[PDB]
Amino acid sequence: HMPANHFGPIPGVPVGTMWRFRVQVSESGVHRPHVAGIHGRSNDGAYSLVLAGGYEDDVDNGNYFTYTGSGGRDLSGNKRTAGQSSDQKLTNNNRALALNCHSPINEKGAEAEDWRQGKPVRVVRNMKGGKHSKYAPAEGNRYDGIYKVVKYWPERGKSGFLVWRYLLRRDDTEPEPWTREGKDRTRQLGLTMQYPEGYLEALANKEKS
DNA sequence: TCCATGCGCTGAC
DNA sequence: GTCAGCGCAATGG
């Protein structure tokens, strides 16, 4: 089994692999947290992230995308998400992701000195991101490969509050699952949406009324 | 092609 | 132990 702090591709899981639920992606080890968008350790880096339309400031352009840090939210009331209500900080997950950038951590943002040498980030695209992105899968989750943090900086988001932003760029030899060659490669490998054991059945039952 | 609301759960300290 | 949290197969206005 792969350790929680494993950087890079997970052996046995090619780009294009799909899962219906987040907990499945966790089980696979591609993205351990079942809720958080960022999986990271503040003294090491970010191992993976998921684009799921959870933050209004994300900008998805396929091989390039601007990701938003987490936080700057008031979850009092046993919540897991909310709108921005305060400034984000370069701490926890946000700091973990900045460490991937090939450059020393910088409180005012930083750029990489050869982004390709930065630490790898496993990127997963979720269908909820499709409300504002043409690269999101139609259903569930899809592993799109390895990306690297080219740079990160702070600025006011749409809500007026400060948010941390990261520019990620793809660095994977496998083709993008959303392109023609990616679509083909997925078929050849015979990859298909994976569901938890007994789900499809339980679903067919439910669909009787 | 909605939006708000809590809850169980797991990884990081 | 505490807290964060880009969920959700769910539930209600």
Side-chain angles (χ1 to χ4, degrees), chain A residues 1-78 80-130 132-196 198-200 202-205 208-209:
Chain A
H1 308 308
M2 291 290 98
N5 57 0
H6 171 74
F7 275 104
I10 303 297
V13 185
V15 311
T17 304
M18 307 158 273
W19 302 269
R20 176 59 187 79
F21 296 110
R22 286 281 306 268
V23 285
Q24 284 174 274
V25 188
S26 300
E27 281 148 26
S28 74
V30 170
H31 190 70
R32 302 280 180 134
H34 57 277
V35 184
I38 302 173
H39 178 204
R41 292 186 176 185
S42 60
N43 76 325
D44 199 9
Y47 313 98
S48 60
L49 60 75
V50 43
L51 277 167
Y55 285 68
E56 66 187 325
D57 293 301
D58 292 352
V59 186
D60 191 355
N61 277 305
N63 286 306
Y64 280 97
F65 72 83
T66 300
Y67 200 67
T68 317
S70 62
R73 298 173 167 187
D74 196 313
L75 306 182
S76 73
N78 198 26
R80 302 298 176 278
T81 305
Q84 299 314 111
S85 59
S86 52
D87 290 350
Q88 289 193 341
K89 303 171 181 178
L90 193 58
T91 63
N92 309 345
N93 294 322
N94 295 356
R95 177 177 202 254
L97 187 52
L99 290 174
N100 287 53
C101 191
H102 189 269
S103 169
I105 187 77
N106 189 303
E107 207 53 56
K108 300 175 76 292
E111 183 181 299
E113 186 253 291
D114 181 28
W115 63 280
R116 287 195 172 73
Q117 290 193 71
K119 313 192 183 197
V121 190
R122 289 188 301 276
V123 171
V124 175
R125 277 189 176 71
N126 179 286
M127 69 78 71
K128 298 192 198 68
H132 307 294
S133 164
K134 81 173 186 189
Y135 303 96
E139 179 193 13
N141 307 276
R142 187 188 66 225
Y143 174 52
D144 290 353
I146 302 302
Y147 284 70
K148 307 267 180 65
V149 183
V150 180
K151 70 147 72 171
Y152 59 95
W153 68 94
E155 73 169 305
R156 313 229 317 183
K158 298 180 186 168
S159 66
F161 292 102
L162 196 90
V163 296
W164 275 97
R165 310 191 80 203
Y166 307 75
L167 175 67
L168 281 108
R169 176 169 174 178
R170 195 155 183 286
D171 195 2
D172 199 296
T173 57
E174 283 303 83
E176 310 89 314
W178 63 80
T179 64
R180 187 70 213 183
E181 7 188 304
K183 179 183 186 176
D184 286 340
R185 189 62 184 174
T186 293
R187 289 290 182 180
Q188 317 182 329
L189 300 177
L191 305 179
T192 69
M193 183 63 78
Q194 300 178 63
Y195 305 73
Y199 177 70
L200 287 174
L203 186 58
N205 297 312
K208 284 196 176 190
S209 57

